Design an enzyme around this catalytic site. Structure first.
Site, PDB file in Angstrom:
ATOM      1  CE  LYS A 173       7.530  -1.503   6.595  1.00 12.54           C
ATOM      2  NZ  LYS A 173       8.275  -2.765   6.750  1.00 12.54           N
ATOM      3  CG  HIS A 225      -0.952  -0.188   3.849  1.00 15.67           C
ATOM      4  ND1 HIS A 225      -1.044  -0.894   2.674  1.00 15.67           N
ATOM      5  CD2 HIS A 225      -0.035  -0.836   4.601  1.00 15.67           C
ATOM      6  CE1 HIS A 225      -0.218  -1.919   2.710  1.00 15.67           C
ATOM      7  NE2 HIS A 225       0.406  -1.909   3.872  1.00 15.67           N
ATOM      8  CE  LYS A 245       4.116  -3.976  -0.209  1.00 12.93           C
ATOM      9  NZ  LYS A 245       3.532  -3.224   0.930  1.00 12.93           N
ATOM     10  CB  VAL A 256       0.184  -6.383  -4.711  1.00 22.73           C
ATOM     11  CG1 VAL A 256       0.279  -7.312  -5.918  1.00 22.73           C
ATOM     12  CG2 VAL A 256       0.380  -7.187  -3.426  1.00 22.73           C
ATOM     13  CG  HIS A 286      -0.142  -6.986   7.905  1.00 16.97           C
ATOM     14  ND1 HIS A 286       0.550  -7.236   6.735  1.00 16.97           N
ATOM     15  CD2 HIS A 286      -1.105  -7.939   7.982  1.00 16.97           C
ATOM     16  CE1 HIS A 286       0.022  -8.281   6.125  1.00 16.97           C
ATOM     17  NE2 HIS A 286      -0.996  -8.718   6.855  1.00 16.97           N
ATOM     18  CG  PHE A 287      -4.086  -3.591   3.620  1.00 19.38           C
ATOM     19  CD1 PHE A 287      -4.934  -2.546   3.971  1.00 19.38           C
ATOM     20  CD2 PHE A 287      -4.494  -4.465   2.630  1.00 19.38           C
ATOM     21  CE1 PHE A 287      -6.192  -2.381   3.343  1.00 19.38           C
ATOM     22  CE2 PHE A 287      -5.724  -4.302   1.993  1.00 19.38           C
ATOM     23  CZ  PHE A 287      -6.579  -3.264   2.346  1.00 19.38           C
ATOM     24  CG  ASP A 288      -4.162 -10.424   6.462  1.00 19.12           C
ATOM     25  OD1 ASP A 288      -2.901 -10.534   6.485  1.00 19.12           O
ATOM     26  OD2 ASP A 288      -4.963 -11.408   6.572  1.00 19.12           O
TER      27      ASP A 288
END
Length: 119
Positions: free
Chosen positions: A7, A12, A36, A38, A114-116
């Site tokens: 995912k 990403h 979504k 951003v 995850h993209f922080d």
């Protein structure tokens, strides 16, 4: 059953124009149940992005400690939903930049889930 790892790749990674966000937000299924707000894509190799999990350790925005910032800048694209965008015609402002990325990593093997943020 999509892994968290996958995912992240779907949401990403684009290791491969003003058009880009509209298409890619659709193609990557980020417009499927809502627009979504951003999202960021990273134009670097999977290998380079996964190596971030052993680069600079920093706090995540949610206060967890498993975030990692890239020592080098990286080419990315921010997609930001325009105020004129109405679901299911999601409308995005595309923007290029080269910045350090911050990802959360997890698992064995320890990979980005995850993209922080970007800085």
């Amino acid at each position: 059953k999509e892994t968290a790892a996958a995912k992240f790749e779907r949401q990403h990674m684009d290791s491969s124009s003003s058009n880009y966000c509209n298409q890619m937000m659709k193609s990557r299924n980020l417009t499927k149940d809502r627009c979504k707000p951003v999202n960021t894509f990273v134009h670097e190799s999977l290998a380079d992005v996964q190596a971030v999990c052993s680069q600079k350790n920093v706090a995540c925005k949610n206060g967890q400690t498993n975030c990692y910032q890239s020592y080098s800048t990286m080419s990315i694209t921010d997609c930001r939903e325009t105020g004129s965008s109405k679901y299911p015609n999601c409308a995005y402002k595309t923007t290029q930049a080269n910045k350090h990325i911050i990802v959360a990593c997890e698992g064995n093997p320890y990979v980005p889930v995850h993209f922080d943020a970007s800085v």
